[PDB]
Amino acid sequence: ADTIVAVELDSYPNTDIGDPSYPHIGIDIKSIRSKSTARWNMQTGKVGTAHISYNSVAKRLTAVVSYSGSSSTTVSYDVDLTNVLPEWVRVGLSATTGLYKETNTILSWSFTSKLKTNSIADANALHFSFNQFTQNPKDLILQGDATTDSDGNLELTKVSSSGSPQGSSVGRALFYAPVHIWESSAVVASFDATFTFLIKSPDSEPADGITFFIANTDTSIPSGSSGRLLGLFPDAN
Amino acid sequence: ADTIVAVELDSYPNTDIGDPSYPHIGIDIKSIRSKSTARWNMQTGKVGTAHISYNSVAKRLTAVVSYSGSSSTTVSYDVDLTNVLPEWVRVGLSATTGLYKETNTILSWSFTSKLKTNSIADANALHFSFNQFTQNPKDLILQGDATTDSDGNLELTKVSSSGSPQGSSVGRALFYAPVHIWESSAVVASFDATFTFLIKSPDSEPADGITFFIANTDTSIPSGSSGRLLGLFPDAN
Amino acid sequence: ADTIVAVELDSYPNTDIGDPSYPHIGIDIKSIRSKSTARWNMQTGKVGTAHISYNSVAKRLTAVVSYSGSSSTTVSYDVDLTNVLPEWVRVGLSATTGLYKETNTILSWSFTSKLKTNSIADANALHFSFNQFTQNPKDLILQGDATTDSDGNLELTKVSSSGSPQGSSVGRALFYAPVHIWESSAVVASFDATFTFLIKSPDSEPADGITFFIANTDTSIPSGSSGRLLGLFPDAN
Amino acid sequence: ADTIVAVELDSYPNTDIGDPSYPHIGIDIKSIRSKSTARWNMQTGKVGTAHISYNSVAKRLTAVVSYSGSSSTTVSYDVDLTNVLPEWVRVGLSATTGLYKETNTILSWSFTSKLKTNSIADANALHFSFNQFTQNPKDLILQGDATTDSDGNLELTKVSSSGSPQGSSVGRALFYAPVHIWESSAVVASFDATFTFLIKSPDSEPADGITFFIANTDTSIPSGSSGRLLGLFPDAN
Ligand SMILES: OC[C@H]1O[C@H](Oc2c[nH]c3ccc(Br)c(Cl)c23)[C@@H](O)[C@@H](O)[C@@H]1O
Ligand SMILES: OC[C@H]1O[C@H](Oc2c[nH]c3ccc(Br)c(Cl)c23)[C@@H](O)[C@@H](O)[C@@H]1O
Ligand SMILES: OC[C@H]1O[C@H](Oc2c[nH]c3ccc(Br)c(Cl)c23)[C@@H](O)[C@@H](O)[C@@H]1O
Numbered sequence: 001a002d003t004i005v006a007v008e009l010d011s012y013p014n015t016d017i018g019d020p021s022y023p024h025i026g027i028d029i030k031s032i033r034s035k036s037t038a039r040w041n042m043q044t045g046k047v048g049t050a051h052i053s054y055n056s057v058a059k060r061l062t063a064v065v066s067y068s069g070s071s072s073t074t075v076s077y078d079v080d081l082t083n084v085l086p087e088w089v090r091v092g093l094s095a096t097t098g099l100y101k102e103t104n105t106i107l108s109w110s111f112t113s114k115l116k117t118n119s120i121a122d123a124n125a126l127h128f129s130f131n132q133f134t135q136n137p138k139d140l141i142l143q144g145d146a147t148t149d150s151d152g153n154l155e156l157t158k159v160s161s162s163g164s165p166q167g168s169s170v171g172r173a174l175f176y177a178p179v180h181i182w183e184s185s186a187v188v189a190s191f192d193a194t195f196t197f198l199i200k201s202p203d204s205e206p207a208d209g210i211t212f213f214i215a216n217t218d219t220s221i222p223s224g225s226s227g228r229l230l231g232l233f234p235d236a237n
Numbered sequence: 238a239d240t241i242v243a244v245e246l247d248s249y250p251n252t253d254i255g256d257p258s259y260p261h262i263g264i265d266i267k268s269i270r271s272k273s274t275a276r277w278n279m280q281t282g283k284v285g286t287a288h289i290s291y292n293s294v295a296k297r298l299t300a301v302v303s304y305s306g307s308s309s310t311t312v313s314y315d316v317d318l319t320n321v322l323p324e325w326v327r328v329g330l331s332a333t334t335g336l337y338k339e340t341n342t343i344l345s346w347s348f349t350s351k352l353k354t355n356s357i358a359d360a361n362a363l364h365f366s367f368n369q370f371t372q373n374p375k376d377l378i379l380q381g382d383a384t385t386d387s388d389g390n391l392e393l394t395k396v397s398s399s400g401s402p403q404g405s406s407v408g409r410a411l412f413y414a415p416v417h418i419w420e421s422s423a424v425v426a427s428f429d430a431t432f433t434f435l436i437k438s439p440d441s442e443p444a445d446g447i448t449f450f451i452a453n454t455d456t457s458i459p460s461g462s463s464g465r466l467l468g469l470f471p472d473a474n
Numbered sequence: 475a476d477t478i479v480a481v482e483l484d485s486y487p488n489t490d491i492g493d494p495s496y497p498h499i500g501i502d503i504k505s506i507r508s509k510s511t512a513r514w515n516m517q518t519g520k521v522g523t524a525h526i527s528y529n530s531v532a533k534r535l536t537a538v539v540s541y542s543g544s545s546s547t548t549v550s551y552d553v554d555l556t557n558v559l560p561e562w563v564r565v566g567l568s569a570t571t572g573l574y575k576e577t578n579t580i581l582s583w584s585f586t587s588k589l590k591t592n593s594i595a596d597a598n599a600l601h602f603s604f605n606q607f608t609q610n611p612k613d614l615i616l617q618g619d620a621t622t623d624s625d626g627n628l629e630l631t632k633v634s635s636s637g638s639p640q641g642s643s644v645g646r647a648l649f650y651a652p653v654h655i656w657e658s659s660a661v662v663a664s665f666d667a668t669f670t671f672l673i674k675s676p677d678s679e680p681a682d683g684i685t686f687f688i689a690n691t692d693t694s695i696p697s698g699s700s701g702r703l704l705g706l707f708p709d710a711n
Numbered sequence: 712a713d714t715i716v717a718v719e720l721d722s723y724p725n726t727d728i729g730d731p732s733y734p735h736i737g738i739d740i741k742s743i744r745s746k747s748t749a750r751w752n753m754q755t756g757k758v759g760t761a762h763i764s765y766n767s768v769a770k771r772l773t774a775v776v777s778y779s780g781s782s783s784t785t786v787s788y789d790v791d792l793t794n795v796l797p798e799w800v801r802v803g804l805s806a807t808t809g810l811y812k813e814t815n816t817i818l819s820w821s822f823t824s825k826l827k828t829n830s831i832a833d834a835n836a837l838h839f840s841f842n843q844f845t846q847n848p849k850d851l852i853l854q855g856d857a858t859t860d861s862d863g864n865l866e867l868t869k870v871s872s873s874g875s876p877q878g879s880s881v882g883r884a885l886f887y888a889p890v891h892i893w894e895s896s897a898v899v900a901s902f903d904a905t906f907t908f909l910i911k912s913p914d915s916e917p918a919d920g921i922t923f924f925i926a927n928t929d930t931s932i933p934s935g936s937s938g939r940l941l942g943l944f945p946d947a948n
């Protein structure tokens with residue numbers, strides 16, 4: 001199995017597998033069963049922003065999800081990532097729909113990782129930023145249903161040519177380069193990610209969610225990971 | 238009185254005013270009496286590095302102080318900085334000697350502050366980096382005894398022309414521009430600082446310490462802030 | 475007199491003092507009489523963007539001014555800036571109106587300066603970015619008529635409470651910190667600036683222009699610098 | 712054939728194929744026959760630094776190669792890179808030896824590419840920085856003889872376990888991710904690279920050189936590209 005750490009924007013409460021009884025954001029460490037969650041007043045049809053951060057000194061993975069003038073939902077979790085992840089990883093975005101559906105539309109995404117070693121200059125750095133997506137994003141590994149559209153958006157899950165979301169979809173986008181997310185001689189390892197997103201749905205209870213995740217480099221969509229497993233895990237353990 | 242938040246590298250245990258009984262690093266919020274400390278195996282005559290970070294989501298101010306191959310001392314403290322500091326601040330370095338003495342030599346210093354508001358692009362940013370100091374550092378406000386030397390170092394406290402440290406010294410260096418360190422509409426406010434330093438001393442128990450601090454914009458060295466008060470506070474309350 | 479290098483967005487052709495006979499962008503080195511100009515299809519009432527760059531190896535100061543889908547005007551000039559400017563400068567924006575008028579509204583501004591010396595890490599850096607302006611921009615030196623408005627814009631020249639531009643106005647905004655724009659031991663010195671702007675006017679021939687400029691640190695608006703002298707020069711020599 | 716743009720640090724004058732009669736730096740556009748060269752006072756056994764820059768407004772590709780206190784060699788060339796390179800590229804370092812030999816040791820490498828579109832925020836960015844190299848650099852495509860060593864250096868050409876350079880060697884290292892180096896709607900495209908290097912040799916006339924290059928994404932070492940062709944070209948046309 002892969003090794004996964006994620007920030008989930010989970011629109012659909014799957015209380016049979018431990019979700020709280022509301023839409024929520026969560027921090028996931030090697031399980032769909034979040035280690036920490038917060039209530040999320042998700043707003044269909046409005047552009048949201050997520051900002052995720054972590055550093056190895058603080059050892060606190062945090063996320064905030066906002067809609068302008070609209071709400072600010074925050075979650076954090078204390079964890080030593082170096083003890084969980086391999087030292088080389090790929091970073092990505094995932095999304096699913098199930099019986100119920102929603103767009104999982106990414107409008108922009110940025111990511112920064114640093115390793116520091118007793119200088120004002122980083123010992124290692126990686127940064128990428130997209131404020132739109134090309135028709136042929138050569139620096140993305142697209143998995144499952146994920147595609148880019150004529151508007152420059154990344155559609156993680158399937159949408160029809162009219163823009164309507166489809167059920168039973170899974171898709172992911174990984175940055176092409178492996179990231180050296182920790183190294184045993186570094187003094188500090190830190191990372192930050194931001195993305196903006198648009199979730200539209202006609203459904204009473206839109207589903208299922210989208211995530212930013214960090215994984216082993218050769219990560220692939222697990223078999224059986226549609227709907228409530230957000231394209232990340234093979235089961236609900 | 239000024240309003241001060243600091244990371245102290247405190248070489249001299251002043252147990253009468255609450256220091257632990259060893260050299261230590263500490264996080265100071267409006268008092269010399271640190272809110273959190275860690276033991277510090279300080280090494281005279283070796284170049285050290287300090288890395289300080291905070292973000293408004295995590296609400297955890299952290300520092301790590303290292304000497305290569307030598308030791309890694311870390312301290313953190315959970316606090317909401319926006320509720321403590323004014324929204325405009327100056328950032329700086331301070332140092333003192335007292336009866337006992339040490340160089341408080343800064344070899345490099347960098348600082349980054351960001352404000353983010355629902356885009357992959359910062360809503361506001363400030364960054365500065367010095368890997369050496371000019372003879373006339375026009376972007377620094379030098380206070381007290383602080384000066385730059387012919388080697389490109391910032392000598393926060395007095396040193397003789399042979400390089401020997403002097404007692405009863407206080408000095409500070411502030412970045413010239415005010416920094417907008419938080420703002421009530423921002424989704425996230427974050428800052429990072431790094432500096433490298435050299436503390437030499439002939440004394441059995443070198444004193445007194447050096448700090449990175451954040452203050453009201455018009456901050457000045459308090460009267461009576463030499464030695465154990467590290468140039469930051471007018472008393473030990 | 476001050477020492478000035480500027481990029482001018484010159485809406486009004488003052489052919490008596492050497493302007494071409496059209497609105498134009500220009501590179502100005504110690505004179506209002508541009509060293510290089512390009513025709514500018516300026517569009518009142520639309521948001522424009524300017525990007526300015528220079529590096530000491532290439533020795534080519536360049537600017538591009540764009541309106542989305544609208545036009546792209548570019549100018550460059552080969553010059554060794556280190557031989558013209560003092561090693562410490564302030565950077566700023568200036569604007570004027572004269573008999574004829576226009577808003578000189580700045581919506582965002584960023585600036586980066588680097589000094590490099592045989593490492594992958596900069597020897598010195600300064601960066602600032604504003605994507606809006608506070609009511610009390612403590613890190614700006616406002617000169618003349620320049621003010622910030624309730625919308626978060628910087629109004630370099632006077633506008634009425636209805637937003638109508640006024641004639642015979644001059645204003646400038648400088649970044650608070652001096653910038654070490656070159657240093658004799660650096661291998662490379664480089665700088666980049668971006669701003670976005672909005673020029674509205676009811677006038678047949680809107681006037682007079684706005685600039686990004688670099689000057690001696692103590693620069694002030696010259697006497698007699700309204701209208702065609704864009705707040706930068708005391709005469710048209 | 713591949714499509715190549717390079718900055719060459721050419722230690723060995725191959726005057727039969729157009730080199731000047733001295734060690735030199737050069738800018739290469741689709742040929743080994745440099746479009747522009749400068750004399751280079753190369754210093755065996757000393758660490759050097761190269762800084763390379765380009766932007767689409769200025770249209771001037773420049774390089775400077777320095778040894779501290781030692782010499783500063785600069786070359787530039789006016790060219791519109793968007794008309795030469797594909798819009799997606801890989802970036803890399805190459806080196807060769809031939810009959811005569813030298814180490815082609817890279818100690819650090821950084822690279823930044825930006826695309827800007829009428830905001831203070833980049834429309835697209837990629838940055839990477841290595842201040843040393845891992846034993847298994849998962850974000851590098853190593854070609855030919857290139858390897859990383861136990862000291863954290865990248866040895867582009869073969870060296871023995873005692874550190875002695877070998878003849879008839881070719882090697883390259885490419886960054887794993889493709890780079891979107893230009894795009895037809897961008898207002899500006901810019902890139903910067905820095906690396907530090909160490910060239911040791913016992914030979915009277917050390918050979919052959921090392922380069923930073925930009926190529927089509929699927930670039931490979933051409934057959935017959937050892938020695939004077941610096942691993943980049945299949946012939947001397
Ligand atoms: O998309 C929402 C959910 O739809 C499905 O689960 C169901 C939620 N409501 C239901 C109602 C009926 C039945 Br049948 C099923 Cl499986 C479900 C499953 O696909 C879940 O994995 C998914 O989280
Ligand atoms: O520099 C170390 C310290 O020296 C002084 O306190 C003393 C430490 N040891 C002593 C021994 C004797 C006497 Br007298 C004095 Cl005040 C002290 C004071 O200046 C303190 O503020 C300072 O922390
Ligand atoms: O704002 C545009 C210009 O208005 C003035 O110059 C004039 C341009 N057209 C005119 C027409 C009449 C007279 Br009177 C005057 Cl001074 C001028 C002067 O204020 C110029 O400096 C300025 O460039």
Ligand SMILES: OC[C@H]1O[C@H](Oc2c[nH]c3ccc(Br)c(Cl)c23)[C@@H](O)[C@@H](O)[C@@H]1O
Nearest residue numbers: 723725808809810811918919937938939
């Ligand atoms: O490494 C230096 C050079 O060595 C070779 O060319 C020669 C330079 N001096 C010579 C002297 C003798 C002979 Br045989 C040969 Cl091929 C050469 C060839 O391998 C060249 O491609 C290379 O630039």
Ligand SMILES: [Ca+2]
Nearest residue numbers: 010012013014
């Ligand atoms: Ca769920």
Ligand SMILES: [Ca+2]
Nearest residue numbers: 247249250251
């Ligand atoms: Ca103390």
Ligand SMILES: [Ca+2]
Nearest residue numbers: 484486487488
């Ligand atoms: Ca004019």
Ligand SMILES: [Ca+2]
Nearest residue numbers: 721723724725
């Ligand atoms: Ca050659």
Ligand SMILES: [Mn+2]
Nearest residue numbers: 010019026034
């Ligand atoms: Mn959940």
Ligand SMILES: [Mn+2]
Nearest residue numbers: 247256263271
């Ligand atoms: Mn203390």
Ligand SMILES: [Mn+2]
Nearest residue numbers: 484493500508
């Ligand atoms: Mn003009």
Ligand SMILES: [Mn+2]
Nearest residue numbers: 721730737745
């Ligand atoms: Mn050559």
Ligand code: NA
Nearest residue numbers: 107131132152
């Ligand atoms: Na878009």
Ligand code: NA
Nearest residue numbers: 344368369389
């Ligand atoms: Na130094």
Ligand code: NA
Nearest residue numbers: 581605606626
């Ligand atoms: Na605005």
Ligand code: NA
Nearest residue numbers: 818842843863
């Ligand atoms: Na090294």
